[PDB]
Design a protein around this nucleic acid. Structure first.
Ligand SMILES: [Mg+2]
Ligand SMILES: [Mg+2]
Ligand SMILES: [Mg+2]
Ligand SMILES: [Mg+2]
Ligand SMILES: [Mg+2]
Ligand SMILES: [Mg+2]
Ligand SMILES: [Mg+2]
Ligand SMILES: [Mg+2]
Ligand SMILES: [Mg+2]
Ligand SMILES: [Mg+2]
Ligand SMILES: [Mg+2]
Ligand SMILES: [Mg+2]
Ligand SMILES: [Mg+2]
Ligand SMILES: [Mg+2]
Ligand SMILES: [Mg+2]
Ligand SMILES: [Mg+2]
Ligand SMILES: [Mg+2]
Ligand SMILES: [Mg+2]
Ligand SMILES: [Mg+2]
Ligand SMILES: [Mg+2]
Ligand SMILES: [Mg+2]
Ligand SMILES: [Mg+2]
Ligand SMILES: [Mg+2]
Ligand SMILES: [Mg+2]
Ligand SMILES: [Mg+2]
Ligand SMILES: [Mg+2]
Ligand SMILES: [Mg+2]
Ligand SMILES: [Mg+2]
Ligand SMILES: [Zn+2]
Ligand SMILES: [Zn+2]
Lengths: 92, 53, 73, 111, 100
RNA sequence: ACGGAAGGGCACCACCAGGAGUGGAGCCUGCGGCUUAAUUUGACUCAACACGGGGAAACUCACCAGGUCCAGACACAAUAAGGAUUGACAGAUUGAGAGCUCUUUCUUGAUUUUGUGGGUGGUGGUGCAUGGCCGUUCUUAGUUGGUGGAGUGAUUUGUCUGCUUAAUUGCGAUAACGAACGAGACCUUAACCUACUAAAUAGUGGUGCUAGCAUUUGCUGGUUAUCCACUUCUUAGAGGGACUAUCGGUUUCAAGCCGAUGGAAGUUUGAGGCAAUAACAGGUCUGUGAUGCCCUUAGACGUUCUGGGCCGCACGCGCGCUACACUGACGGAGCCAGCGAGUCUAACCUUGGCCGAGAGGUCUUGGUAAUCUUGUGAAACUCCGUCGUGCUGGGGAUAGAGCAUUGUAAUUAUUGCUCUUCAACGAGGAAUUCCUAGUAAGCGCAAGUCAUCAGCUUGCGUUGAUUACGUCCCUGCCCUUUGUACACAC
């Protein structure tokens, strides 16, 4: 789906910073929380991420819990052009 | 377009839906839990409602 | 689900695709001189003198104040 | 600033929702229930499973992401919600663990 | 100091042992108190049809949740109040303290 | 399994003796049919028809007339920064400041677009492909191994002649013994506790201060920082209490049953909750991000927007509500409940004051609640009157006009209020429903759905009868015996 690269990088940097992301299954919400982007934008971008094995989902009462894998964190690392082992959402 | 999904949903059955199954019919709005009656029948034991009489 | 005969006019009429022109960005060409600008641009502090105003008729149309900046010079 | 009735049904549906969430993703870890203890300064969620090393992951990475998930969904402050894992005893005396083991065996294709 | 402790649970023996250890600690510190006043148990009732569809006999089902509420009024300084709210944390029982 | 076969025992979803009715009228609501662009659809004896928590203006919504959009992930191929593609003022166009599309050029710039595969969604189909849930068989007492015994075997005994019980509940009998599930036990609730713990978020008494009358002490009241005392009433928690106790009858004289006394309670104390095996090719894919398969998947059956429809009416049925009047209608006064619900990043239950005939409005106030709404000052009821056997001051349908409230929007009146209109109905044929005590019936109140809309349902309390304390005649049910040419089983 078409979306500006500004908001794509917003979704991706929030995912790389936190490691998880919730998206209440409410299209036409037009304002996600934790992120100033559309809920439809973040949901569909994450779905396109899940399809290429990077991140997994759970619906669980219309809520779309997403958590990313190691392929996801390295792909987001090279996508955002960050140093090797900069910071995951996996601190001790 | 902005007009798409323009219609107000401030009241009526289109304003509410089941928090579990997103159904519009059979809502239990008592005590602000907003579950359809079937899903309430399933989840009542772990919500904390029980049958005594 | 019997059938749909399409009693509406058979009017599959999908729009343009931002019609494919040739090369663009025509400011001016000046032989061994500095080039001026066609499409005298918008008067917003938001537009940094890079966005053309269009001119169809009776008005000029903008890109930064993206719809409403109507001047008749 | 909520009435006590709505508060108690709120924690009821909260427990039910997180139990449904945990039995959805933690099926292959022997998730056999969850318990909540709200407390001054913190609320704790004690998961009772069998494969505690699998629900923890490497250095608690899965516990960390689960805490972050429930915090993001329930709008808790970071740190006010904590999760603990627990190797449940008497695994045979747990209907859901035996049920999910049966489910996984039948999905693997056992008679 | 005029503090009030309110317990607003559903588990009656959990609430009862919480209140009993509260009052024995209070009388161990020889504190004045209005004892545990037990408010009326409020029953939250929800009556539904058993069937998901419409047919059958019109059989109804009433799921209830009893809520038990107690309150104890204390006059005791801030330090014994702080250890009182540090202690008496029971699972499934909600407590709150108000002052003045 | 069935019998218009027998024996025994049961049930107001059976009857008896009755009660209140329904069926008759008007209206509300559901169903069929008819009509329609659509009048979405499921369910058809109990076990469909005020059921889908289904009281639909829009949403709901699935149907109809039209208009958009894509939320077609991902992989591969093609176009391609001399640009893939997106968006847009105004005008035409359109119900429509939907660029939807067209004119005109602007804008953006690898996210895309086109094709292929492959997905995704679907209140689309299949409840006869399913899971789960529910209902029913079936509110009755029934069901099953182990080891023995009988029989070639299917199978049977155990699980039974009698007597008893609400009950394969027990006494007993006995090729059976010992068990299990169900019933019961259990749990909740309603009744009792002047015995325990307590309590300005429940009360009571006294003390102060204070109002009125009598005054002679008194009677009736008010009073939050006037305190003091208590827990009878109120709330709870922990317990106790009834086990058919005692007595008298009756029974092989055992299980038990009947009567009386005592007792708050002597129909397993009352009412429920839970409730076995085996099944129905019961219902539900329209509760489910529960689902296999099939269909569709981009001028889509996805989704959303506008407007209709689900209410449409020659008719036929089912739940009900109003009544057909003096055991009454109306007008004044008198005046008593219980179950419950209620606002936070919202605008809920509203007191009180004022305005308004009214509905309602406005200014404030309390309450996240045993504290405030709320003593929910409910209605039926009672006492005084008016009326007067007249379809009448019964009855209040059908209409016209106006005033308000909810909502974006009320036109096929959302409801409420005012005035006017003032119809059938004179107690209901064949038929047929429910019911044995605080039960029927009458009476209203709260909650559910809910922005607004109860004639519905779920509960609550208020007033409170008659008639049985039985039978198997009808309708069925359980067990035994018997007959069968039945086995999808009369
Ligand atoms: Mg009888
Ligand atoms: Mg009779
Ligand atoms: Mg009648
Ligand atoms: Mg029956
Ligand atoms: Mg519509
Ligand atoms: Mg509609
Ligand atoms: Mg659809
Ligand atoms: Mg079936
Ligand atoms: Mg089924
Ligand atoms: Mg044998
Ligand atoms: Mg033999
Ligand atoms: Mg045998
Ligand atoms: Mg006084
Ligand atoms: Mg005797
Ligand atoms: Mg009983
Ligand atoms: Mg189903
Ligand atoms: Mg209808
Ligand atoms: Mg009915
Ligand atoms: Mg009167
Ligand atoms: Mg009262
Ligand atoms: Mg009259
Ligand atoms: Mg009958
Ligand atoms: Mg209502
Ligand atoms: Mg309506
Ligand atoms: Mg209804
Ligand atoms: Mg014969
Ligand atoms: Mg045959
Ligand atoms: Mg015949
Ligand atoms: Zn639901
Ligand atoms: Zn500008």
């Amino acid at each position: 789906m078409l979306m500006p690269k500004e908001d794509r990088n917003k979704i991706h940097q929030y995912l790389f910073q936190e490691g998880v992301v919730v998206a209440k299954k409410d299209f036409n919400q037009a304002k996600h929380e934790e992120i100033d982007t559309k809920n439809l934008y973040v949901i569909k971008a994450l779905q396109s991420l899940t399809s290429k094995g990077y991140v997994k989902t759970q619906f669980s009462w219309q809520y779309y819990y997403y958590t990313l894998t190691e392929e996801g964190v390295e792909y987001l690392r090279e996508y955002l052009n960050l140093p090797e082992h900069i910071v995951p959402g996996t601190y001790i | 377009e902005n007009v798409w999904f323009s219609h107000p949903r401030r009241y009526g059955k289109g304003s509410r839906q089941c928090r579990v199954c997103s159904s519009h019919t059979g809502l239990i709005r008592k005590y602000g839990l907003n579950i359809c009656r079937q899903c309430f029948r399933e989840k009542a034991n772990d919500i904390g409602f029980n049958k005594f009489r | 689900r019997k059938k749909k005969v399409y009693t509406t006019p058979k009017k599959i009429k999908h729009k343009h695709k931002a019609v494919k022109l040739a090369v663009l960005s025509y400011y001016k060409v000046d032989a061994e001189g500095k080039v001026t600008k066609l499409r005298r641009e918008c008067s917003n502090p938001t537009c940094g003198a890079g966005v053309f105003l269009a001119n169809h008729k009776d008005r000029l149309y903008c890109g930064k104040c993206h719809s409403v900046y109507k001047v008749n010079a | 600033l909520i009435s006590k009735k709505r508060k108690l049904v709120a924690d009821g549906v909260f427990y039910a929702e997180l139990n449904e969430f945990f039995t959805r993703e933690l099926a292959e870890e022997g998730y056999s229930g969850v318990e909540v203890r709200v407390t001054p300064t913190k609320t704790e969620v004690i998961i009772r499973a069998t494969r505690t090393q699998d629900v923890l992951g490497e250095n608690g990475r899965r516990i960390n992401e689960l805490t972050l998930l429930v915090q993001k969904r329930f709008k808790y402050a970071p740190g006010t919600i904590v999760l603990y894992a627990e190797r449940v005893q008497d695994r045979g005396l747990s209907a859901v663990a035996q049920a999910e083991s049966m489910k996984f065996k039948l999905l693997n294709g056992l008679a | 100091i005029k503090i009030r402790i309110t317990l607003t649970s559903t588990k009656v023996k959990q609430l009862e042992n919480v209140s009993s250890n509260i009052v024995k600690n209070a009388e161990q510190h020889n504190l004045v108190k209005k004892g545990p006043v037990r408010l009326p148990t409020k029953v939250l009732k929800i009556s539904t049809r058993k069937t998901p569809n419409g047919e059958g006999s019109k059989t109804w089902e009433t799921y209830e949740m009893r809520i038990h509420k107690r309150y104890i009024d204390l006059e005791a300084p801030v330090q014994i109040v702080k250890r009182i709210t540090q202690i008496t944390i029971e699972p499934g029982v909600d407590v709150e303290v108000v002052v003045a």
